[PDB]
Amino acid sequence: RFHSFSFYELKNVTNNFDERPISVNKMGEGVVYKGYVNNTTVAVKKLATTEELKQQFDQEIKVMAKCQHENLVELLGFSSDDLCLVYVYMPNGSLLDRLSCLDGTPPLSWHMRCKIAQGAANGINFLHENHHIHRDIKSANILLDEAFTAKISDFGLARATVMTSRIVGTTAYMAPEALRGEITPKSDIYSFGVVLLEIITGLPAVDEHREPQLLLDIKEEIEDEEKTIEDYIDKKMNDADSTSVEAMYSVASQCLHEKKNKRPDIKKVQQLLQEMT
């Protein structure tokens, strides 16, 4: 299974869990730190009720032990002697940050965006084939390696027509039934639909200083002929073509069906994204 790391080894390779940003070991905020084990760069997540957090720690390791795939983040180890999770470092960060060009990275081309959408769908397919529900599909949870290969991340909420008293996930990406407490892989499809809109538009899922505030509402604007998908295509690309953009939008629109049973399954989503290219 997985190797244990001494808390002190992790402390020592993250410069005593140096909370200062890399620019000034903090990569994100528990808190994620950049570490170095031998000649390998790693991501160290230091977890921050206490009982609930230990359950999330145990659950995540359990999901990672079972779910190994090219389009899923790989867990390298853990520490429980304070809780830490050690992952393969993704040098190109999240899809959210690449879409926003955070820290001055160049915009992603339409070509790269198509590969990332296909890769992300492949990762979700592996999860659904293996009877797992992610529960928090979003662009911040799609990481990018050295070749911009999409890697589904954050299995802290992952579960193996069921209800819950503890509604979890990210509101701007959640399916109506998920907001009501239902647990289903059909909700992961809906959230993926929002990610596809982020890829087409380059816009965040929610923006308080925007009309509409929620990205998913652009589907209604397009359906009611108030706007076109053309109007919303990210202007930070030079290689997008109407045919493939409309093909990705058709997939996003199908994923975003309000009625869970009318949405395509992940295998259909993969097929449609393959046909697009």
Ligand SMILES: CC(C)n1ccc2ncnc(N[C@H]3CC[C@H](N(C)C)CC3)c21
């Ligand atoms: C699962 C996650 C902890 N993880 C696993 C491997 C890995 N490698 C690099 N970064 C990661 N997380 C970043 C958090 C901060 C994010 N922004 C700057 C806000 C960008 C992504 C990684």
